[PDB]
Amino acid sequence: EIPTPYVWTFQPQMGAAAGASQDYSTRMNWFSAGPDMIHDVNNIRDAQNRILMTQSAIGGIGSRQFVEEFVPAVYLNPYSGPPDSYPDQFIRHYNVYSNSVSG
């Protein structure tokens, strides 16, 4: 359905960004509203993911070039896919060459 996009925190060092997580600092609370309201809220939010959708299609990278890329990506429905194709890269303590491991 309509979820909430992830946020990418720029890592001052390396420039390889970090793990993305569902934003919550701007969560538009509203469960205390009405029916038509709860209906319109998911509509405007859908338009959001819609914009961030087009805005997405278009060593380490700097900050200035970081805002243009690594934009908030919407991961539609949940884990949906098989245990093979998961977010992975969306995990903070996760590397490519190997599985997520830390000392």
């Binding site: 701007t26 538009m28 338009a47 959001q48």
Partner: peptide, 8 residues
């Protein structure tokens, strides 16, 4: 964004 625009 639509989140602010709505809340003005």
């Amino acid at each position: 964004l639509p989140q602010w625009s709505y809340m003005h």
